């Protein structure tokens, strides 16, 4: 279950990074779409502690489509 089972650690190592926090998460098996929503709790930590994170995806069986960043302490991932 490479889709479901990778949530959790995925949540933690995000929430563990000094500066940011997983705000919102959505999964639809039918549409195969994992929408993530990461937020800032600082002032430029969403770019710094981020480049790193796209090494974490693509070491299991990934799903990465787009990644929108709109500086409303806002970063919208899709693992579809």
């Amino acid at each position: 279950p490479a889709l479901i089972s990778r949530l959790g650690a995925l949540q933690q190592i995000i929430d563990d990074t000094p500066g940011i926090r997983l705000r919102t998460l959505s999964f639809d098996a039918a549409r195969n779409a994992l929408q993530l929503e990461i937020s800032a709790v600082s002032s430029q930590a969403l770019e710094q502690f981020s480049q790193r994170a796209r090494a974490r995806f693509r070491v299991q069986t990934g799903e990465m489509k787009p990644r929108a960043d709109g500086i409303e302490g806002r970063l919208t991932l899709e693992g579809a």
């Binding site: 279950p1 479901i4 959790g8 933690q12 926090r21 919102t24 998460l25 999964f27 639809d28």
Partner: protein, 77 residues
Amino acid sequence: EPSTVIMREAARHGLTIVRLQPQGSRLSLTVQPADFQALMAWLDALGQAGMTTATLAVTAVAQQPGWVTVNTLVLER
């Protein structure tokens, strides 16, 4: 017996089910604010028992670091 296994495992992971309403082969669940890790452990356990997560939408509780509200949750056999 699907509802029973869902509820027994829920209790085993510290979670509280409030609503358990079928659509058909799928059950729409309403769940109280939960530790996200516990939620996943629970769903993963259910996955091993043949009920897979069809839909899941959660939002972080802003003042509680590991916790989420469960907005949507639908299981399917």
